[PDB]
Amino acid sequence: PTVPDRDNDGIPDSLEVEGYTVDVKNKRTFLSPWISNIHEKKGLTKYKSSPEKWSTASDPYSDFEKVTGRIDKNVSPEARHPLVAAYPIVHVDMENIILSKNRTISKNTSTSRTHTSGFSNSNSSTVAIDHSLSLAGERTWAETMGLNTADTARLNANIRYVNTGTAPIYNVLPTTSLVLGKNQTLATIKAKENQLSQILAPNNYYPSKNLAPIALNAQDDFSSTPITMNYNQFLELEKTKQLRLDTDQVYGNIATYNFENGRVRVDTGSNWSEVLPQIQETTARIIFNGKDLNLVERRIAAVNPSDPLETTKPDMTLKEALKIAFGFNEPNGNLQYQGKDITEFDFNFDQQTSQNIKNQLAELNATNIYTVLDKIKLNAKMNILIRDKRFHYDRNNIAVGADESVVKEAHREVINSSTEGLLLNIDKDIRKILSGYIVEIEDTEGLKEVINDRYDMLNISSLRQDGKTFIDFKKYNDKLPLYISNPNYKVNVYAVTKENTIINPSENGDTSTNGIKKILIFSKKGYEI
Amino acid sequence: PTVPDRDNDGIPDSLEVEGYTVDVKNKRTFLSPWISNIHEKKGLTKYKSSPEKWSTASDPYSDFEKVTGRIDKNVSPEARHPLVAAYPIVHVDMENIILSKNRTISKNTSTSRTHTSGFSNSNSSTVAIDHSLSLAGERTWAETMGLNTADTARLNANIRYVNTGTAPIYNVLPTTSLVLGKNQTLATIKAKENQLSQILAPNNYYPSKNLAPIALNAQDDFSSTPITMNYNQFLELEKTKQLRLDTDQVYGNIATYNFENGRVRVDTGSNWSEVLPQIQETTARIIFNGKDLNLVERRIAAVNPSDPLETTKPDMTLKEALKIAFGFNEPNGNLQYQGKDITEFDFNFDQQTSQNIKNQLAELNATNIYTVLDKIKLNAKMNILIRDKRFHYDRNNIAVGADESVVKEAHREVINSSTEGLLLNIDKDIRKILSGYIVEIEDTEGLKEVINDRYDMLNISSLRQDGKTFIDFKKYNDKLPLYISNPNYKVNVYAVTKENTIINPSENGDTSTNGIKKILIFSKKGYEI
Amino acid sequence: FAKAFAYYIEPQHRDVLQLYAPEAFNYMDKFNEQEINLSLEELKDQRMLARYEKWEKIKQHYQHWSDSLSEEGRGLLKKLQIPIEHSLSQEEKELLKTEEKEFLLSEKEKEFLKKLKLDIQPYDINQRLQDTGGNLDVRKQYKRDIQNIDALLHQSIGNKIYLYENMNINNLTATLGADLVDSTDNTKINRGIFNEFKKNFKYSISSNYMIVDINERPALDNERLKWRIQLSPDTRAGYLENGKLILQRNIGLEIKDVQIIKQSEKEYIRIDAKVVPKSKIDTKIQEAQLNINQEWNKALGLPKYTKLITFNVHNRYASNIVESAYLILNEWKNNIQSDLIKKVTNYLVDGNGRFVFTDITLPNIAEQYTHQDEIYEQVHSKGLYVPESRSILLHGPSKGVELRNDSEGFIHEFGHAVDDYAGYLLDKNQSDLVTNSKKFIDIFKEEGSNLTSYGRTNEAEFFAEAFRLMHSTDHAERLKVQKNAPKTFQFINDQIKFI
């Protein structure tokens, strides 16, 4: 009188194939078969799983443990569903650098998680250094640091680690190598030993935001100036202002759940560098930038016709994936992410998937995938990139621009205006595609006076502690308020999108903002202030 | 015919959900279902727990062992209740420093465990350096130490460890790094190896108060002066006079109870650095400064709607939580802490918590939380700060001041007064937010003579061995008794609160107490002395 | 209903069912366990061919012994099935010059009717065996006929055959039978009284020879009870030519369930019973008797070992009476002065009295006749305090002609016993109630007849009745005696004071 349980995973067969859900009564949890009408009012999710896989995902967590919660309580909520691999995704975030020669340029930097194209399962990022001149007198880096053709500069940066995955790493910390340009490997960050004794929970930093970021140079005797850098490299760096941070997957050990007493102990037998390949070859990979215009990656288990055992997994339709991987729902049967309908997004596919994907729309005789969306079967190894269609993108699929019309529409709310600047309250996302502003005044007869007439003097817009952006004129002015020769003279304000910015002096070293493509954003007369 | 026991924790399920209690008969201990009439007279606590958790709290001690006493007899009483995680909380207390250059400025220090706001699960403290001039002639440290622009000072401090948590650490001791300013990390204190074979019980010091504190500098040959420090830091230090002590979470192993022979053996398999993350994600954190105006941290297990297994734990109402965590009782049905009513306390909430709690107050149709206290459900991950409503506070949530009016009543009890000083008896707690006293004399015609008219001369009050505060006039006088130009001349006494104190000479190096906000305390004619 | 059935069958879904509807799971559990065979038997009873075939088959078994049956046997069964309903010539005719009145003074002439009532009773067996629980000349006939009829049926019943029998509710409890049918709708029965009937109805006993029908047939108007019985292979029963059976005496039956069903637009009452050995249930009876005694022996200081209580009930309604003793006893204490209980019990523990609860006629129950001076002097009723035997008799089967419930019936008998105890304290060697005779007779002249007609009978009944009203649980009854007999109240208050 024992229900057949082939996979030996606690859950009985029939439940696994057809659908079940756990529900708690009084205070005891028992596993129950899905009742369509009586479970829905309670807001429980309808599960599916493999009767022949101790872990449908193939991750180190059993089908049963996941839904009941006997599991490292740190795994993010969205990864509790049996069809979402729970694993870590660590990339490196570099906060700021400083330079000198083996008169020190100490500049703050900004980094973004990257993804490029024939794209492979390996994490990499790319830092971009700000070009605006914080100091007036620092024209020509070559001279601010007494760098000569036969000199060598020393680099001193700060980095922090970011966990954007869904599972914790415990002991080890990843090795990571810096490389400039196509092939110039500047340095490989040593793997400090037995020192990352802290935890990387999803959406957390190491070390946390409350502590100093890890100083890169050891300050010991390992190398006198580990970050040497020949002249030619410095030249390359000055023209490009872009670096990349490649990291491998040598993560730590795994945290397993022990039934006997509920203690979570790190087992020394199971190691992440052997499990990831399995997940990585038997799941469909979806990268999504819906949340905050940052690349969030999830992996879903899809069937592969060619392999017997694999047909055991429940068929997975795309629409549910989006429902279960990110949080989309159907208040009125219309797919949306906090209001924004599904139709505002692009679909791009790698060359392999495309032939396969063209087929499925043919046996359905449809041309708009957005309608018949709920009838597309997912296969193993597809890679899908879903990004908002409204913004322009660069080669590395980073948000870099947008159509001006949306941009203008984004600016129609002037909370306050004076002769010292604007205090706007704009949606946090736009301010990730704006490098700075050029202010100019227009004589009633067509003249044009650009205040900050230097390539590196546009970053004049700060943000107040109430989320109000504040534009200061006296910043790249002469510490003087704004004068107006005529209450009839027009005051023009332009915005410059990232894609259209200049990072270095031109052929003849032009520094004026003349030949810069500028979008008009504001124009109020002298008396309209 | 066996009573069910899913959690395998000795106590049966039904017993765990509905209510039980431990009792002693002749001399044997037995478990009983809560009987309303026979247990209250015995002063027994009504326990509840999770039928599905080997340790409802999730800490390394089972539900059964806690109430039964089979547990490290060192766990503090308040942590014996099944719903309060017993775990360690280590912070560093630095007792006094001395300085010189690689004629030694030796000052006593005072430290307070700190907490600021987006506050995270990471321990940090704050030391405050004494400003009073022990030597008359020791004006300007920059000269008391022959410090030159191209010199270097050596730092050698004394420290002791403080355990304010609820469970013992056994073998290891945490590494901790010194940092000046925002990012100037002066030093990281090494983790001495195989030397902390002693124990750190709650509310104890290491090494105990009866022994010399651990000398910071090694005194060996490892580094001649590991803590070097260029000139500019000293300047920074002179302007700020504040340091920071960040501590990590690397504790030792855990002490477990062995059933076979009742021996408590240190298991080399279980390690605290794996449990805290579990605890930190499933508990509500409560900070209370009631006892002695010091930051006490406790953790309570609260429900998280999103997790089935977690819903198993008994619902926790705020009112009861405070009852079991700190010692509040119900003498007359009014919540109080040894007399002080709950209404004299503040409630502060994190923005996250605010949303949940503001909702919670809406479905109850109440505006004063102090009334509906027994109707607030606690959810997981809330952070609550209960502070005395009577005092002023600074940015790092340290007690720093109070309304002056309250201050006066604290002095209305003159036990004795003479021409050599005052012998007061003030509540031990007030005297940590008072920096000093301003004494002044008033001519019969309205003049004003301030005796210690220097910023660094206000430490004129002592405490006698009978807990009587004693003010000494001859200290910062001319080693002369107190003279009075008129038995009709009024003697004025002012008090100076910490927040309003000056720590460095002013713009024009003013040392007079002119621009200091001073509160009048004790005034008496010449014959009333 | 259908949905519940489905959920019950599926093993994996079985647990879910029990979780959300516990009582419902219990309901379906009892149906599939032992309540599905009953569905099949009842369905076959509508098909004429089936019932006829079943009847024919059973006959074709017992036929051989029917030919063997002797004439004497048939003669006994005849007078058994049908009750049989110039000898004085002396002074009785001169003096003479409801059913017993039609068929057929406060002096020595009413005694001749008591004797004649015993001599004029029909010669019957089934009521006598049930009435007695198992003139002298007739007794010899009874003994021989009962012995002869007993030594007839050697054929044990030894698949399960179900039989039907219609019985008058007045045979179990005539007090409830008067209001069982809704006053405003004679086709419906009030559930409120019904749940009470089922309350303590767990098992029943048949002491006589049941005459039952093989196939269900329409019942008489006053018969709404359709007994069905699960026979035992060892039970001996005797078939008749008119499609009836005579069951062995001293049969035990366990009641598993009692519910209301509908048939031909009218409601009726179904009692499901199973044949079991009577000895097996009697063993259960002694344990129940011990439990009530042990509990009450420690109650009023009584010695633990003394029984003071014997369950002598033997009837079709025995088990509700048994469980009702706890209710009656609990009420008796909660309703009487604690100090009165202690006093009366000391007067009983000192002797060898008993509280006899029975469902047989008083002169044949246990000792009543042993304290009677003449056979014709026998008295049968719910009960009366007997000084000679110092025993309290409570006839469960009967319905008090005056009291509204059992509590009132007991308290009414409690008065006679109280008078005897008072007499013991006062005149040790003289009539316990000789002091109350001239004391109450005078009180009975001025206003004795004013009260209930039961108390008007004599001083003893009046005293016993007055005590009950003065100690009733309904303050209204107690108040009544105050404003209707202010004089009587003071002296009545004074005898109970006597400790």
Residue numbers in the entry:
A (entry chain F), B (entry chain G): 173 to 274, 287 to 301, 323 to 734
C (entry chain J): 217 to 301, 309 to 320, 332 to 338, 368 to 397, 405 to 428, 433 to 773
What does the literature reporting this entry say, word for word?
During the early and late steps of infection with the Gram-positive bacterium B. anthracis, the tripartite anthrax toxin is secreted as major virulence factor in order to kill host immune cells such as macrophages or neutrophils. Like other AB-type toxins, it is composed of a surface binding/translocation moiety, the protective antigen (PA, 83 kDa), and two cytotoxic subunits, lethal factor (LF, 90 kDa) and edema factor (EF, 93 kDa). After cleavage by furin-like proteases, the truncated 63 kDa-sized PA monomer oligomerizes either into homo-heptamers (PA7) or homo-octamers (PA8). While PA8 can bind up to four factors, only three of them can simultaneously bind to PA7. Both enzymatic substrates bind to the upper rim of the PA oligomer via their N-terminal domains in a competitive manner.
We determined three structures of the fully-loaded heptameric anthrax lethal toxin complex, which differ in the position and conformations of the bound LFs. Due to a symmetry mismatch, three LFs occupy six binding sites of the heptameric PA7 complex, leaving one PA site empty. Binding of LF to a single PA protomer is mediated via the N-terminal domain of LF, orienting its bulky C-terminal domain such that the adjacent PA protomer is not accessible for binding. Consequently, if two LFs are bound, three free PA binding sites are available, of which only two can potentially be occupied due to steric clashes. This results in the two complexes PA7LF2+1A and PA7LF2+1B, that differ in the binding position of the third LF. In two of our structures, PA7LF2+1A and PA7LF2+1B, two LFs only interact at one position which is located next to the major LF-PA interface. However, we only found that the N-terminal region of one LF (2LF) resides in the α-clamp, adopting the “open” conformation as described for PA8LF4. In the other LFs (1LF, 3LF), this region is flexible and not interacting with the α-clamp.
